[PDB]
Design a protein around this ligand. Sequence first.
Ligand SMILES: *[C@@H]1O[C@H](CO)[C@@H](O)[C@H](O)[C@H]1NC(C)=O
Ligand SMILES: *[C@@H]1O[C@H](CO)[C@@H](O)[C@H](O)[C@H]1NC(C)=O
Ligand SMILES: *[C@@H]1O[C@H](CO)[C@@H](O)[C@H](O)[C@H]1NC(C)=O
Lengths: 275, 10, 99, 283
Amino acid sequence: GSHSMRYFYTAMSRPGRGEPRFIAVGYVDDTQFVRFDSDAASPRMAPRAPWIEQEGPEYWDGETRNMKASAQTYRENLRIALRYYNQSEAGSHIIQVMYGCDVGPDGRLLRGHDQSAYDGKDYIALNEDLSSWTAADTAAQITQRKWEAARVAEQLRAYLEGLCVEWLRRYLENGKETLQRADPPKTHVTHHPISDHEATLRCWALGFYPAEITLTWQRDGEDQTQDTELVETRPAGDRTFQKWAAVVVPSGEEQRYTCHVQHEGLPKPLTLRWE
Amino acid sequence: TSTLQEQIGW
Amino acid sequence: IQRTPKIQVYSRHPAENGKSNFLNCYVSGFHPSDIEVDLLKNGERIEKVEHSDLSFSKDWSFYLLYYTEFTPTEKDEYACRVNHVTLSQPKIVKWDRDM
Amino acid sequence: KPFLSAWPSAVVPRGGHVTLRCHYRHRFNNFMLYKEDRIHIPIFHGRIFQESFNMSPVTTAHAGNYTCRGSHPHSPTGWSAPSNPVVIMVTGNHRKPSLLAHPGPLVKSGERVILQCWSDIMFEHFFLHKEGISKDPSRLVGQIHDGVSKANFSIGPMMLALAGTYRCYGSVTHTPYQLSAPSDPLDIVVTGPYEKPSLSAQPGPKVQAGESVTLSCSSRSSYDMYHLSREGGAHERRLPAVRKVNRTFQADFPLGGTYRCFGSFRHSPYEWSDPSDPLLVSV
Ligand SMILES: *[C@@H]1O[C@H](CO)[C@@H](O)[C@H](O)[C@H]1NC(C)=O
Ligand SMILES: *[C@@H]1O[C@H](CO)[C@@H](O)[C@H](O)[C@H]1NC(C)=O
Ligand SMILES: *[C@@H]1O[C@H](CO)[C@@H](O)[C@H](O)[C@H]1NC(C)=O
């Protein structure tokens, strides 16, 4: 299977409410494994998954210094953004960054990513070639010109081809029995009356990892994709996920409805029915 | 480092 | 470019009265990031509440999980109360064991 | 605990204005103020500020060390725990000191510079402060030697966040929150890592009075502005960059001495490119 590592940074100003804040989180696939928050009294990069906890002190010291520097860098970028957009220093603004790498089954790089946003809309992104930028507006075009002049893309490309891949591989090994072992969903169907002519059938999937899953309702073998209520996949809080799919069915027709579950932890796709 | 070590200004 | 939060309230494990469990309130799809979330037990704010580290989705909207350990009962009613800049008044979502 | 802040700056000239805000329980109202020595005695005879406290015009009496407490009706005491402390420093109360950079104001990325403050007035402390909103000043004790007091502020390894306009202040014994008039300002600019431009002379660097010579700064990089500097410390000339047909970006400075040019970008006046190679103009 393919895997990914991503870091997500959020830098926020909040004049009169607090000092600017920088939070970073790291994910391998759907599993968060580190965090850094500048608001802590003595901020440090810290483990958020058990399989990273036994990484040595040189790791934590190194990650902490980088985040402290990054926090500083992004505080300045917020100031810069104010100038680019001619905004007042009274307002609250947010920069978001996500970057990282995807690798294939052989552990080799498939794609690298580096995208930034200002106040929740695209600002600038590294292109798939990892050597050019797409800027979303005139403000971002200033940044692009700086980054081209400073050869930033080469630096990002070197990181993405090297350290990013190298560390993802390391983490995938460290956490193999959780990260590389899909847990299939536990499934069931519930029945809830609506009136005395109609009722709801709800197909449940619980305790699965990774988050990717497909729940479908069929009526005599035809998908009810137009008449299916699908809830957003949600975290259980123990590094597994939950989802359900609902369909409103006429009374006495419960038996023509089948729920179909697809997930990598399942040997064969499941077909459930209410009884 | 695992995180991007390069510091990048806008 | 302000986005109001989606809210789900649910337990970590299937609920069974008198058995220890976790109560979750997942807020997502919101922007900006400041948000206030409380879990309530019979209208009253629960004290020992923790949350996940702030992160966001591909569309830049944020998500957080708030959670507390709890033992469900027949009589006790649980909910999640969420305020955000996008909301004139706080939204309250009851925990329904069937949702 | 509340978050107390000074706007636009905690370092403020006599006659200026500064507003203290006490943010607590998602509001900015109903708070009391305290100064460092009296910790449970509200200032202004226990005035309950109904909104942010605007001090204007600022006087020396405003200088001080502040904390706030926010109203908290439904709690043991009427009020919150003390906020973080904010020091309002009032400037303009003594002759200005002097500020110089060693070896100079243009600092290569990753390198260091010394900012020395000095005065023939005996200042107990010196303060170094970068121009801008909500910025903290650095403090050092002054050291006496041969009729001056002085301090060395070390800045670096140099990066953008450290670049800008700096001023320094002294304060004298027994009035630690009262600062001098500011020193003359020093622009500290970071150079690099942006690629160096090319400098050339038209018709050439050999000129004899009184015929015209233009220096051109050029790059393939899309610089928005060029800065022409002549060794010997008169402030650089600046001109907008213009795109040429072969896609270079160029500015022409019509004017001896040894020159260098730097590129820079819109809204970014304190970060410049690596310096061009030097060009010697002779008259
Ligand atoms: C100001 O007051 C606080 C105590 O509230 C003290 O911690 C701090 O060191 C003081 N700052 C100065 C410059 O005195
Ligand atoms: C401060 O730095 C300057 C220049 O590097 C140097 O001349 C002097 O020795 C340093 N120390 C003091 C106390 O001035
Ligand atoms: C491009 O055009 C300018 C202006 O004519 C010319 O002087 C400059 O030398 C050229 N640069 C290159 C690299 O061709």
